Amino acid sequence: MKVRPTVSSSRRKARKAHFSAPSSVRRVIMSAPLSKELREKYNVRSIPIRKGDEVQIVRGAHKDKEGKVTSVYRLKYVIHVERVTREKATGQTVPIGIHPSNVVITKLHLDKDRENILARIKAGREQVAKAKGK
């Protein structure tokens, strides 16, 4: 149960905030879990998904398929992964939208800022446990 007076538990207000969120908030809403190997390597459990990293599908009809993230369509709350597609009546190929909460990241795109994210969350995630241990 919630305690603090600044927190609201209202169905009407919660749906409004979700479906009208700006772009920098939609980034955090679209997160995915890491795989067991990466989770052990980095001591991180989840991260916002980015274009240019590998993924495996674990729910829905397109299960056990893999590929790279080709686009993050924040206005639709879906992602596109290469080679998971469909054909129109004319025979043209069109991608299928997958919600990022039923994939697992098996390899992540890395740069200077991405490394800062992973280091920052890890340091806090272990400081909490160290203080909790007393």
Binding site: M1, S9, S10, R11
Partner: protein, 260 residues
């Protein structure tokens, strides 16, 4: 709202125009022109006797009658047949009233939810806790839109002494569904007879049971009531020698034979 249905300037057309007498909107060029207004029978009108905020929402109860009812509920909580008739599962509890030693008092004695859950199982309260977990449904109407989505059953109530036990056990029992806590000196009739039905299942602590008599001694203007009868067992009275020896002989049987 105070002004709903009265934000127009309608006036009756009077008799002679072959229409019913009722205020009608004035103007032209819209659908709204010429339509009825101000009535409780009219679309977009005003309702009959609009509701006000100065109706009585609260009720005053004599404090003596409050104290009578809470004492009557405590007595009913020590009758095992009444516990079963209110839906509680108590087939494996050793005694009623159920009292546990002060092993729930120390710093972090049951301050973890895992520890508190483990203690309820050993004592014999486990089946009543699992009854709540398995009962959970979606509410069956428009209450879902208004913040009340689910319904479930009630479990045991835990009574403790905040002065001796330490009040840290509230954290441990809070997250388990169905379990409530209350101090011994602030007992609540809403929890002791939920829904107006008697026989709540209660788990006491040793320190709390010792304090219960001192609590009732210090209530100015209240004393425990006297009953209107003295022996509640009706069969002992009727079938005693004092009464059966002075009766007249029976005039008939439970079934009368038909004559003519």
């Amino acid at each position: 709202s105070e002004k709903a249905g009265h934000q127009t300037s309608a006036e009756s057309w009077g008799t002679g125009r072959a229409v019913a007498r009722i205020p009608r909107v004035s103007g032209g060029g819209t659908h709204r022109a010429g339509q009825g207004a101000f009535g409780n029978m009219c679309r977009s009108g005003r309702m009959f006797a609009p509701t006000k905020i100065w109706r009585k929402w609260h009720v005053k109860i004599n404090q003596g009658q409050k104290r009578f009812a809470t004492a009557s509920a405590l007595a009913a909580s020590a009758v095992a047949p009444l516990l079963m008739a209110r839906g509680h599962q108590v087939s494996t509890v050793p005694e009623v009233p159920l009292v546990v030693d002060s092993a729930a008092v120390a710093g972090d004695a049951v301050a973890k939810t895992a520890a508190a859950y483990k203690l309820l199982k050993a004592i014999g309260a486990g089946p009543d806790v699992e009854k709540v977990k398995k009962s959970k449904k979606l509410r069956a109407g428009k209450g879902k839109m208004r913040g009340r989505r689910h319904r479930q059953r009630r479990g045991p109530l835990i009574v403790y002494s905040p002065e001796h036990d330490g009040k840290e056990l509230v954290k441990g029992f809070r997250n388990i569904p169905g379990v409530e806590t209350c101090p011994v000196d602030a007992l609540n009739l809403l929890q002791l007879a939920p829904g107006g039905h008697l026989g709540r299942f209660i788990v006491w602590t040793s320190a709390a049971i010792k304090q219960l008599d001192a609590v009732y001694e210090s209530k100015k203007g209240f004393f425990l009531p006297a009953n209107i009868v003295s022996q509640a067992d009706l069969s002992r009275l009727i079938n005693s020698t004092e009464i059966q020896s002075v009766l007249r002989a029976p005039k008939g049987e439970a079934r009368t034979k038909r004559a003519c």
